[PDB]
Amino acid sequence: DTSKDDWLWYKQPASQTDATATAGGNYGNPDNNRWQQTTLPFGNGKIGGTVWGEVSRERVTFNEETLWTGGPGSSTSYNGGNNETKGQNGATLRALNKQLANGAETVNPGNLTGGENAAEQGNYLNWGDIYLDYGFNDTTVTEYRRDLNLSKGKADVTFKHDGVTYTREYFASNPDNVMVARLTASKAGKLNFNVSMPTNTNYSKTGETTTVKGDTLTVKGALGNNGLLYNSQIKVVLDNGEGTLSEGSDGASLKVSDAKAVTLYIAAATDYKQKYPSYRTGETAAEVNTRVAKVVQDAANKGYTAVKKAHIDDHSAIYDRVKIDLGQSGHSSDGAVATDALLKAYQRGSATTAQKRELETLVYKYGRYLTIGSSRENSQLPSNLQGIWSVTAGDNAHGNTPWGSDFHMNVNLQMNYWPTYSANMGELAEPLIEYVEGLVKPGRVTAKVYAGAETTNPETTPIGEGEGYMAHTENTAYGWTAPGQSFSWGWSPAAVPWILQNVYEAYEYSGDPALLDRVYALLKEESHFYVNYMLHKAGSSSGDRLTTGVAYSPEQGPLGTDGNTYESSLVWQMLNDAIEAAKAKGDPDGLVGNTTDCSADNWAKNDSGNFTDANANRSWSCAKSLLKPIEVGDSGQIKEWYFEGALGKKKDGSTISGYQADNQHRHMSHLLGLFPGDLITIDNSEYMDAAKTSLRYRCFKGNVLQSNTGWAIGQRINSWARTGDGNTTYQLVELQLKNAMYANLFDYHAPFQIAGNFGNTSGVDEMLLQSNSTFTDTAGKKYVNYTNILPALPDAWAGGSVSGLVARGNFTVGTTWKNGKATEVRLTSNKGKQAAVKITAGGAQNYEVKNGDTAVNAKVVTNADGASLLVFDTTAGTTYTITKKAS
Ligand SMILES: OC[C@H]1O[C@@H](O[C@H]2[C@H](O)[C@@H](O)[C@@H](O)O[C@@H]2CO)[C@H](O)[C@@H](O)[C@H]1O
Ligand SMILES: C[C@@H]1O[C@@H](O)[C@@H](O)[C@H](O)[C@@H]1O
Ligand SMILES: [Ca+2]
Ligand SMILES: [Ca+2]
């Protein structure tokens, strides 16, 4: 019974599905454009398919997460893009900073660049395709449907051809490390097809072979760019013997005749490893082949029913954690509409309320689905710009694949991991944590070359004990931590502080001690790096403060300013978090310090880069207090640059060079303290009005809401949510759905970029629940990371319910509301932490707490603004119910 499952579903194959939305760069080929707008993704965090659902020549576009060009072996001098001749072991940066300190508003930052060789950078590759050719004379069908069952983690295709009902089922199992295709024909003798696996023609190879052994084909080779070994295998299994399984008449296929029912077991691997400097397992071609062979052998020995059960079990265990009911229709509703038609209706303004709710909740749920498919606990790599799904390939960076489908760390990679915790998929953040840990070794090289932070043995010094690791915007599978070849996107060292927010949240949401140790080690060394090498006393262009020196604000404005709001906001957050992590550990390193004898003069350095006063206070508390990251400009906006006057102008009325004149720059790099950070909050709201002014300019021309890239709308959804304005937040949700989603619900730039799918999920979470702020009651008592129920509920969602969301401190949160106000909150304490609960839609002072059959003593505390929390002790594993006071 699949009647209660969430489906995306279509009444026609990918080839006949609407692909008329903006294609974007790199998708001028019709077939590639069709791919990104209309195919349905599935994956196990490692391998992925995108299903076309073609009646005759069926196609599943195929990926493996580690098929990456570039890195060691791409040249004989691979050093992660670092240009020693430009960086001069920090000397270049030190001299440019002195020019800024001496009053310059900008400098020529041309030698703060690197990463010049595109072959060394490399990119993510589409592996190729699986073709299942049914031979058919005509493609004439009835009762056709293709779907993606998000609830069971599988794709389905069904049609009736010539009296024969055909079925296809595809999934990729994490427990058994295998992709499965189940193919059936209704009447015996009537399942005939050829199975092949061509690799993308557009990457170079060395010694590729397609081979047929038993019921198994193997494509096998090495990448020509870097020697990376790849191997994929399809094992065909006819149902209990019946059918002619023969080698294809071209040596490169397997032919099935006169079945019945078939199960294909599909597996793939490379010899990649996240292991600096070699990035290889050290396997031979023959070893890779044996490995891959086992996975399909074992899958085949388990059999279809067993592997399917284990996959659905594993998938639904994570997928079913969160339920949402806004009064949506679904695939089983009377009058149900296909997903492509629903999208068109929503865009037209012809969709009913129920259909609008169906699209909004489907998109929400798809962001959770896509996380499960691209980013599992045992993935070798986090989700990239496209998750794990791509059709394009070329050897070099900045080539055939847009932005190399890379790890883009000046908003996109961060966005990928915004909903991971709040949407109850905490374990799925593990590959991100490992990736950032993976940046330490190569980033120590960058830190040395560009900022003069030398770790004595960068390969064997534990994380936390080195001098610092530096990385920038464009990153890869191979420690490409160098700044890019052009400064005006390439230089962004605060990328690391930022991604460390995503990493630190793993601890904030769980309270796990093992995670605390890992996040502490990362924060300690990056905080060390900034304090000792990056920060300097600002010159006159940036006022009285420590700044981060030569800066670029992603991705507009002047090149090489004396810090900026982006870097200062992020370093402020990082120090805030480092201090919190140190405190949770007992501050065993004595690094928190204090603000006694605290001055930006404490950062004076001699010619060598050693501090003039070895003993001056440069503690984490001191540095934090000296950043002063937020300044309000003459349009009442948060300034993006410290010399800013009115919006996008200098104090003299001239235009800020490189500022996007219509005010709609996609990035909002100066508002990171509002979201995802904790600098500007509803409780600490000194700069809330300015953040809202800045947001209005970045989203509106007068009273008219502007479109933008899918990810940019996604960040705006989250930012507006943190302000408490549900109505404006919802307008941005509608905008994203109308203007940045293809028929397959992939978010687009254009072209397809997955970050906005993840940002949508996060944004909806922040509407319904926030947990990042600090409450101060009238007596000065602080409640950090209090649970905020319904902080930005739109008037459009008058009633509904949600369960399974996660708040910081490790609480599971369900809430039911009607007439715009909470009727029940269910709070499950997972760690036994003291609860502190705000009910924004209703007022917590009007409610009371129970533990099953008993009343809980909850204290009502309020602040200056007449807002209240319910404050109560809890025990691990207990669910508390909060309901309106009853007589
Ligand atoms: O060259 C790498 C940088 O590309 C920027 O994206 C450009 C894109 O390459 C160009 O074709 C044009 O259309 O504008 C885009 C945005 O300016 C990235 O934004 C930057 O991060 C680098 O990847
Ligand atoms: C993946 C890329 O990330 C940043 O470079 C943005 O400025 C681009 O517009 C694009 O979204
Ligand atoms: Ca992955
Ligand atoms: Ca926080």
Side-chain angles (χ1 to χ4, degrees), residues 45 65 374 379 381-383 388:
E65 64 166 344
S374 68
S379 299
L381 294 163
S383 48
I388 57 171

Side-chain angles (χ1 to χ4, degrees), residues 450-738:
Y450 293 94
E454 191 181 5
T455 295
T456 294
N457 187 336
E459 301 190 30
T460 62
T461 299
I463 304 176
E465 274 72 72
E467 283 304 302
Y469 51 104
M470 184 192 228
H472 296 83
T473 298
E474 297 194 327
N475 274 269
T476 66
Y478 302 117
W480 192 257
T481 54
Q485 68 202 284
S486 170
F487 185 89
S488 49
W489 53 261
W491 179 263
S492 199
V496 178
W498 198 352
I499 205 67
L500 288 177
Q501 284 195 51
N502 290 267
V503 170
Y504 178 66
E505 286 180 17
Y507 168 75
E508 268 194 320
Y509 278 88
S510 71
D512 189 278
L515 283 178
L516 179 57
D517 293 340
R518 287 167 83 190
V519 310
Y520 175 69
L522 286 162
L523 290 164
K524 172 189 169 185
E525 178 160 344
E526 194 56 13
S527 289
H528 192 268
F529 179 56
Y530 267 83
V531 165
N532 287 281
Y533 305 88
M534 296 298 287
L535 303 178
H536 85 146
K537 173 184 203 179
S540 52
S541 77
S542 292
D544 185 21
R545 50 165 57 82
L546 282 177
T547 65
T548 56
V550 183
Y552 185 60
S553 187
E555 290 190 1
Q556 73 167 351
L559 276 68
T561 58
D562 193 350
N564 60 25
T565 301
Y566 168 69
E567 294 259 337
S568 292
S569 285
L570 291 173
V571 169
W572 185 98
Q573 197 61 54
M574 184 181 58
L575 293 175
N576 179 260
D577 295 356
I579 286 163
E580 285 176 7
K583 285 186 46 157
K585 294 184 45 79
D587 193 11
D589 297 306
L591 301 176
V592 166
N594 59 44
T595 59
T596 307
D597 296 317
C598 165
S599 168
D601 288 319
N602 293 1
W603 271 261
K605 291 178 185 165
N606 65 24
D607 286 358
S608 80
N610 298 331
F611 290 103
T612 305
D613 185 343
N615 304 130
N617 182 358
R618 288 178 297 267
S619 61
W620 298 348
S621 288
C622 172
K624 193 186 150 182
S625 80
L626 292 166
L627 300 163
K628 288 309 304 157
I630 312 305
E631 209 158 271
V632 184
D634 302 315
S635 302
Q637 86 289 6
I638 296 198
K639 298 181 190 180
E640 193 168 344
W641 309 270
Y642 296 112
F643 57 59
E644 180 174 336
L647 180 67
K649 301 185 192 311
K650 308 215 276 153
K651 287 281 184 185
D652 64 5
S654 52
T655 298
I656 292 179
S657 167
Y659 176 85
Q660 186 182 309
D662 69 8
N663 295 330
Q664 308 302 306
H665 188 59
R666 57 198 185 280
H667 291 267
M668 302 191 307
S669 295
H670 60 314
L671 301 186
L672 309 177
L674 170 62
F675 180 89
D678 311 323
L679 188 52
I680 303 179
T681 69
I682 55 161
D683 299 279
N684 281 258
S685 62
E686 185 177 16
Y687 301 109
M688 190 58 83
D689 293 335
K692 289 174 77 79
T693 297
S694 287
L695 282 174
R696 280 187 296 262
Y697 284 124
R698 274 288 213 297
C699 301
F700 293 89
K701 288 181 176 171
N703 279 337
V704 180
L705 185 61
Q706 304 299 115
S707 190
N708 215 303
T709 70
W711 72 257
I713 302 180
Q715 188 180 336
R716 287 157 169 74
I717 292 164
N718 282 270
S719 309
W720 279 103
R722 290 279 189 86
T723 72
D725 188 347
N727 286 341
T728 304
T729 310
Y730 177 70
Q731 289 191 74
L732 286 159
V733 170
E734 292 183 294
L735 189 83
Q736 195 187 47
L737 270 48
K738 278 145 51 162

